[PDB]
Amino acid sequence: TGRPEWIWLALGTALMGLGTLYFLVKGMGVSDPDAKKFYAITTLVPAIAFTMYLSMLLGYGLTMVPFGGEQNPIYWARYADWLFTTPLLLLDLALLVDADQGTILALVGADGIMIGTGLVGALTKVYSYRFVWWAISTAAMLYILYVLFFGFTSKAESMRPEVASTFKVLRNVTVVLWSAYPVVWLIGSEGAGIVPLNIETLLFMVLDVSAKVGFGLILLRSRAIFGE
Amino acid sequence: TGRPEWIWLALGTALMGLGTLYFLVKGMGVSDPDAKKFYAITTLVPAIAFTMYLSMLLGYGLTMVPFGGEQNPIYWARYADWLFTTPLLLLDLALLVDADQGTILALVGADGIMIGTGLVGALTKVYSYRFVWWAISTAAMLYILYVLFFGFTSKAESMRPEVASTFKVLRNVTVVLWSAYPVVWLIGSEGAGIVPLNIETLLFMVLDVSAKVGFGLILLRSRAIFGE
Amino acid sequence: TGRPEWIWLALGTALMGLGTLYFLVKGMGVSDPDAKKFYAITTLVPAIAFTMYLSMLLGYGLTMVPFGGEQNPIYWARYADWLFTTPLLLLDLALLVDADQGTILALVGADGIMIGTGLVGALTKVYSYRFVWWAISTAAMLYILYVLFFGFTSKAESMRPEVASTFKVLRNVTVVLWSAYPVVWLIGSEGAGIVPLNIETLLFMVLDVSAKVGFGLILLRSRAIFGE
Ligand SMILES: CC(C)CCC[C@@H](C)CCC[C@@H](C)CCC[C@@H](C)CCOC[C@@H](COP(=O)([O-])OC[C@H](O)COP(=O)([O-])O)OCC[C@H](C)CCC[C@H](C)CCC[C@H](C)CCCC(C)C
Ligand SMILES: CC(C)CCC[C@@H](C)CCC[C@@H](C)CCC[C@@H](C)CCOC[C@@H](COP(=O)([O-])OC[C@H](O)COP(=O)([O-])O)OCC[C@H](C)CCC[C@H](C)CCC[C@H](C)CCCC(C)C
Ligand SMILES: CC(C)CCC[C@@H](C)CCC[C@@H](C)CCC[C@@H](C)CCOC[C@@H](COP(=O)([O-])OC[C@H](O)COP(=O)([O-])O)OCC[C@H](C)CCC[C@H](C)CCC[C@H](C)CCCC(C)C
Ligand SMILES: CC(C)CCC[C@@H](C)CCC[C@@H](C)CCC[C@@H](C)CCOC[C@@H](COP(=O)(O)O)OCC[C@H](C)CCC[C@H](C)CCC[C@H](C)CCCC(C)C
Ligand SMILES: CC(C)CCC[C@@H](C)CCC[C@@H](C)CCC[C@@H](C)CCOC[C@@H](CO)OCC[C@H](C)CCC[C@H](C)CCC[C@H](C)CCCC(C)C
Ligand SMILES: CC(C)CCC[C@@H](C)CCC[C@@H](C)CCC[C@@H](C)CCOC[C@@H](CO)OCC[C@H](C)CCC[C@H](C)CCC[C@H](C)CCCC(C)C
Ligand SMILES: CC(C)CCC[C@@H](C)CCC[C@@H](C)CCC[C@@H](C)CCOC[C@@H](CO)OCC[C@H](C)CCC[C@H](C)CCC[C@H](C)CCCC(C)C
Ligand SMILES: CCCCCCCCS[C@@H]1O[C@H](CO)[C@@H](O)[C@H](O)[C@H]1O
Ligand SMILES: CCCCCCCCS[C@@H]1O[C@H](CO)[C@@H](O)[C@H](O)[C@H]1O
Ligand SMILES: CCCCCCCCS[C@@H]1O[C@H](CO)[C@@H](O)[C@H](O)[C@H]1O
Numbered sequence: 001t002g003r004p005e006w007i008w009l010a011l012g013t014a015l016m017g018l019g020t021l022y023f024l025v026k027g028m029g030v031s032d033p034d035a036k037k038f039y040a041i042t043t044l045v046p047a048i049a050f051t052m053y054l055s056m057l058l059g060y061g062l063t064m065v066p067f068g069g070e071q072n073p074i075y076w077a078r079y080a081d082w083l084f085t086t087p088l089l090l091l092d093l094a095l096l097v098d099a100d101q102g103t104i105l106a107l108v109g110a111d112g113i114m115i116g117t118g119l120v121g122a123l124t125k126v127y128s129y130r131f132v133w134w135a136i137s138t139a140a141m142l143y144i145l146y147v148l149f150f151g152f153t154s155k156a157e158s159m160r161p162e163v164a165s166t167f168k169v170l171r172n173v174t175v176v177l178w179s180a181y182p183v184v185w186l187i188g189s190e191g192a193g194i195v196p197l198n199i200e201t202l203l204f205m206v207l208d209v210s211a212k213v214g215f216g217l218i219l220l221r222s223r224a225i226f227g228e
Numbered sequence: 229t230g231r232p233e234w235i236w237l238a239l240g241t242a243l244m245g246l247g248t249l250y251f252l253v254k255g256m257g258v259s260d261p262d263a264k265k266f267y268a269i270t271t272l273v274p275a276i277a278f279t280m281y282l283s284m285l286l287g288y289g290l291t292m293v294p295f296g297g298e299q300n301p302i303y304w305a306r307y308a309d310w311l312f313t314t315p316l317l318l319l320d321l322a323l324l325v326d327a328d329q330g331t332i333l334a335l336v337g338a339d340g341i342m343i344g345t346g347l348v349g350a351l352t353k354v355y356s357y358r359f360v361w362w363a364i365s366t367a368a369m370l371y372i373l374y375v376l377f378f379g380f381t382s383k384a385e386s387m388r389p390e391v392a393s394t395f396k397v398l399r400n401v402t403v404v405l406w407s408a409y410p411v412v413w414l415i416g417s418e419g420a421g422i423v424p425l426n427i428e429t430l431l432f433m434v435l436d437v438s439a440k441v442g443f444g445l446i447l448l449r450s451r452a453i454f455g456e
Numbered sequence: 457t458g459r460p461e462w463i464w465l466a467l468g469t470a471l472m473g474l475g476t477l478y479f480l481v482k483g484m485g486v487s488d489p490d491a492k493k494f495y496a497i498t499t500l501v502p503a504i505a506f507t508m509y510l511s512m513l514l515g516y517g518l519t520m521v522p523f524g525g526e527q528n529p530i531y532w533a534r535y536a537d538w539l540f541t542t543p544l545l546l547l548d549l550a551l552l553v554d555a556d557q558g559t560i561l562a563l564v565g566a567d568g569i570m571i572g573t574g575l576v577g578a579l580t581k582v583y584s585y586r587f588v589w590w591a592i593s594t595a596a597m598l599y600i601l602y603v604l605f606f607g608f609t610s611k612a613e614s615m616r617p618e619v620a621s622t623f624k625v626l627r628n629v630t631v632v633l634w635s636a637y638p639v640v641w642l643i644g645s646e647g648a649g650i651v652p653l654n655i656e657t658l659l660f661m662v663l664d665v666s667a668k669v670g671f672g673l674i675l676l677r678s679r680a681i682f683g684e
Contacts, residue, residue: 037329037330037333038330039330040330040334041330043334044337044341047341048337051341054364055348058352058357059354060352060357084340100489102492102494102495102496103496105497106496106499106500109496109500110500110503112540113503113504117507120507120511120516124516126514126515129516261558265556265557265558265561267558268559268561269558271562272561272562272565272566275569276565279569279572279573286580286588288576
């Protein structure tokens with residue numbers, strides 16, 4: 001069913017909307033052309049998350065998928081949200097470290113595959129097949145995290161200390177936060193229903209707010225976004 | 229029902245196809261690398277609109293959405309059309325004024341949110357919820373128009389007189405034309421059915437032709453597209 | 457029905473996965489910033505094709521479309537695959553010849569129209585209307601092939617012999633391979649069912665493997681990807 005978890009959806013909606021408003025206000029007085037790019041990328045993340053959480057709260061972002069001999073509530077809007085927000089987050093990191101175009105395309109492509117296959121897995125009717133998609137999606141995520149942890153760090157070391165240190169924090173946060181998603185998916189009602197949809201939703205909400213507002217706070221409050 | 233308004237859909241389809249053919253022919257003899265970008269962006273707009281209007285005329289682009297205790301005809305293809313055409317129009321304006329990358333991303337993102345939420349609103353089954361989406365979409369549009377009217381104009385003033393004057397005309401046309409969409413939506417069968425689907429369709433057709441052919445005519449017939 | 461052709465879907469899935477793994481391994485030791493872009497673009501093509509063929513094999517990528525007085529199996533995942541892979545292939549060619557941004561946008565836009573209308577045609581319930589979409593899609597393809605054969609070749613001649621010769625081979629392969637798709641569509645169960653779904657699927661599989669692995673082999677094994 002899709003009703004008890006409504007509270008986490010409303011809180012999520014509220015936190016994304018507030019985070020968006022905050023980034024918007026904070027970015028009005030900025031003139032630095034570089035920081036300006038960071039504000040545009042980072043402000044869009046929670047703006048999108050706001051619309052997606054609201055769709056889940058209202059019901060539009062919820063669908064029913066049969067599997068395991070039953071109709072299961074699946075929040076497809078979670079994926080529509082991630083489809084656009086994760087590439088943006090990747091872009092933030094890429095700009096901070098001045099990543100090559102080829103590597104950015106590789107990451108965005110891997111990221112689209114990660115979310116796309118995750119969504120296919122969420123809407124798959126054959127229970128067993130859902131885990132095949134989960135595995136492929138997780139493999140794509142690991143590829144991304146690998147490149148971000150090893151490739152970008154080396155790139156970050158060529159920057160001034162402020163950029164390098166802020167990237168390190170965002171990098172660590174990213175590896176931990178992102179890795180948590182496939183685990184929650186696996187234990188929740190979408191994979192092995194070890195935890196109820198109610199707790200599943202709360203966990204994804206905490207993760208999303210941390211990734212779509214927390215990440216942005218750390219970045220936009222640092223001096224690293226200023227090119228100088 | 230979806231039959232009486234067929235005439236506006238056929239006229240729309242014909243006007244978009246002709247506008248596409250015209251821009252195509254007109255752009256063949258162009259060598260200026262800058263003008264060339266304007267032709268590619270501007271010619272794609274009605275080409276896309278052509279396929280979308282044709283889908284609406286044939287029926288593919290029409291769906292039924294229950295709300296208000298009835299099954300209502302909703303032309304989702306109108307939105308699929310706008311999803312790709314509005315960002316292109318924004319790109320035309322951006323190139324004309326040499327807008328920063330961060331501002332272009334902000335606009336395109338706001339634009340995707342505008343159309344995306346508008347579509348969610350059009351497919352929402354709870355009558356009352358439809359207006360919440362309309363409001364969010366309108367807020368995103370106002371953000372875009374604000375940046376285009378104030379931000380781009382200042383940017384346009386740094387260009388030669390021909391570019392500045394052509395931008396001013398396109399700017400004024402854009403603010404007036406775009407603002408008309410949420411009003412038509414609000415009075416039509418998608419919001420408060422004050423006007424029938426028949427007139428609703430005709431109004432959107434006039435607006436679309438003006439925006440996807442009229443805008444292009446003003447731009448491609450001006451010398452502003454030449455960088456020199 | 458969607459069962460006998462399963463073998464071509466499994467072979468396709470296997471070949472795309474292997475081609476992806478091969479490109480991945482082959483690209484690990486590359487440092488040339490230019491070649492690196494080619495590897496990212498080219499490796500993503502079969503990675504995407506892998507997920508799409510797997511969805512068709514598992515059943516997710518298969519839908520039923522009524523027309524001709526019957527429910528017909530339609531592999532929509534074929535189109536979802538092409539939607540992302542063809543623009544990438546176009547990008548490979550564009551980078552090899554250093555095509556202008558306006559021409560790249562024109563091609564990608566024409567390409568999205570080509571696949572999008574092809575998909576609309578595949579999901580159209582009115583038999584006769586399916587061919588209208590096929591014609592529009594084919595017209596867009598011809599536009600693309602025209603620009604690739606005449607426009608890019610001239611651009612390729614300004615490059616060193618290795619780039620020019622490799623482009624010529626990729627160009628010829630592209631014109632022949634791509635042109636084959638609308639023909640297979642036309643003779644298969646999606647258009648005039650002259651050939652059964654079983655052979656239709658096998659033919660598209662041979663074409664896809666040739667285009668998503670064969671094309672990449674020719675490119676990534678050449679010295680043309682090195683800018684120097
Ligand atoms: C069933 C399977 C067949 C299907 C697979 C599932 C699949 C869907 C999931 C995988 C995701 C996949 C789609 C991703 C596509 C990636 C592709 C586009 C990549 C193209 O490649 C782009 C480069 C970017 O490199 P750069 O950053 O520009 O480096 C520059 C220079 O080296 C300096 O670096 P410095 O800063 O550190 O000093 O990838 C980075 C280069 C790295 C240096 C090398 C990385 C190597 C990889 C981590 C190992 C790859 C795995 C192996 C082939 C085998 C394992 C298979 C697994 C299925 C068990
Ligand atoms: C319920 C709500 C929480 C949810 C909100 C609904 C939401 C879905 C709709 C809003 C759309 C939103 C998604 C848009 C995202 C925008 C974000 C990406 C922007 C990032 O920011 C990008 C910059 C681009 O700036 P620049 O052009 O490069 O300027 C350079 C220099 O200043 C010279 O300029 P010159 O040429 O004129 O001289 O935005 C331009 C900077 C401008 C100068 C300043 C603009 C300020 C705004 C107009 C005011 C913003 C509104 C306020 C926060 C509060 C109102 C809230 C409303 C809900 C009532
Ligand atoms: C029912 C109909 C109304 C609907 C139509 C169906 C439609 C959906 C299918 C068509 C696809 C359409 C959407 C494509 C949009 C294209 C548009 C964005 C193009 C904008 O234009 C971009 C340019 C790119 O040019 P460049 O490469 O940068 O060249 C630079 C310089 O010239 C040096 O060149 P060098 O290297 O060779 O030396 O297009 C290349 C310029 C070329 C040089 C000139 C090409 C001309 C065309 C081949 C002819 C166009 C056709 C005619 C208008 C009429 C036929 C209509 C048909 C329906 C029968
Ligand atoms: C939807 C589809 C239908 C619409 C397609 C659009 C198309 C009709 C218009 C194409 C227009 C452009 C060529 C515009 C003119 C450009 C001018 C500079 C003139 C040059 O035109 C020469 C070449 C292109 O070379 P360049 O552009 O690099 O120079 O045309 C290439 C000419 C080629 C060689 C001929 C065209 C071949 C057609 C496909 C076959 C026609 C049938 C023949 C009668 C059969 C011949 C076979 C015999 C051997 C049995
Ligand atoms: C240059 C680079 C930036 C490009 C990198 C390519 C990278 C984006 C690709 C990841 C690809 C893919 C593995 C993920 C897509 C799977 C998706 C088709 C499945 C959706 O499920 C559709 C079902 C649901 O009932 O209906 C079936 C209904 C219809 C018959 C299906 C029609 C589907 C269309 C093809 C739309 C697909 C939507 C994509 C998810 C949007 C990607 C946006 C991107 C720009 C971030
Ligand atoms: C770098 C920048 C250019 C990026 C900027 C990000 C900006 C594009 C985002 C706007 C985001 C969003 C608010 C709008 C999307 C809402 C959409 C999910 C709702 C569609 O409704 C789907 C329902 C209909 O029955 O079915 C449910 C069916 C399936 C279960 C749903 C699967 C949906 C997929 C996630 C596809 C979404 C399609 C997008 C509309 C395409 C955007 C293209 C863009 C490149 C212009
Ligand atoms: C700068 C440049 C790169 C941009 C160039 C623009 C170029 C991409 C556009 C080609 C446009 C168009 C002709 C093709 C789209 C047709 C598509 C809407 C039809 C899908 O059919 C949807 C039906 C199926 O049951 O459901 C109806 C269900 C819902 C009510 C429909 C909501 C649909 C959304 C609008 C999503 C459309 C998905 C696109 C196919 C994705 C394009 C990705 C691109 C980045 C490669
Ligand atoms: C007597 C046996 C009756 C079996 C009926 C089952 C038809 C199942 S289709 C199934 O749909 C999912 C969601 O679309 C895809 O994820 C799967 O891959 C695909 O296989
Ligand atoms: C006795 C009461 C029975 C109520 C049944 C109503 C289920 C309504 S779902 C509804 O679907 C729309 C379109 O998907 C979304 O836009 C809305 O937000 C969502 O709420
Ligand atoms: C007595 C006559 C009853 C006729 C019922 C037919 C309704 C057909 S809708 C049809 O759906 C397709 C797929 O969506 C679109 O491709 C077509 O363009 C559109 O026309």
